[PDB]
Amino acid sequence: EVETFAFQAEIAQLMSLIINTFYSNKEIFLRELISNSSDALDKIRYESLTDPSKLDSGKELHINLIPNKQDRTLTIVDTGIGMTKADLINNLGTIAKSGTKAFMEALQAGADISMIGQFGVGFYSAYLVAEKVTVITKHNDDEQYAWESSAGGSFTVRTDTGEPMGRGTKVILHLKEDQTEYLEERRIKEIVKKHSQFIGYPITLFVEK
């Protein structure tokens, strides 16, 4: 049972701008997704300060980076607060309509795509390097869901029958054919050291057979 939704016009416009603008500094997608994971981890940590049972779904607070060259995927896993179905549909828990408006206003006032995270829509920088993005998520107050989009104006949401995650979010980047440098260990390490050196959660880069 799969539900298909239209993006709001402004988000479709943001995604087409990210996909079609010539902009060589694509590596910032990873900084933006790690920053989103850190924000999600901060949220569940804050809730746990007054209600420890919020961590019954998992006490460890971390970020894993999992490249898979066979599948041509880079997955960013975190054990943060996750998202409900309603959050997923409402632009993955962002204020993306007003964030896109602010981002566009900034781009015409000198900004570049790398500043996208300052406008709360850094998730969509995934489409700098991915032809398709799958988001698997589990929030304490809802069931596990999979969101997916290859852009083109629509996204899908379905109940996820995959491996249970406990709590958190997994962003699966199905990389464009010419963006496979982001599966190479040395390239991912370089990006994490350059842009994510002060993130307050352990970031583990998995290796492959």
Binding-site positions read 36, 78, 97, 123
Binding test (CB under 6 A) with ligand A1AYD, winner from 3, 60, 71, 105: 105
Q: If you count them, how many residues does the chain have?
A: 209
Applying CB under 6 A, which part among 42-50, 60-68, 103-111, 167-175 lies near ligand A1AYD? 103-111
Q: Which residue has the closest beta carbon to ligand A1AYD?
A: 106
Q: Which residues contact 96 (CB under 8 A, 6 or more apart)?
A: 8, 10, 11, 14, 120, 121, 124
Looking only at Cα atoms, what is the longest distance across the chain? 47
Which residues fall in the annotated binding site for ATP? 36, 78, 97, 123
Binding test (CB under 6 A) with ligand A1AYD, winner from 106, 113, 115, 199: 106
The least distance separating ligand A1AYD from the CB of residue 115, rounded to whole angstroms, comes to: 10
Q: Where are the alpha helices (DSSP H) in the chain?
A: 9-20, 28-50, 85-89, 96-107, 185-195
Applying CB under 6 A, which part among 30-38, 102-110, 143-151, 165-173 lies near ligand A1AYD? 102-110
| Dihedral sign for Cα atoms in the order 135, 97, 114, 25 | positive
* Angstrom distance (rounded) from CA 136 to CA 6: 19
Binding site for ligand A1AYD (CB under 6 A): 102, 105-106, 109
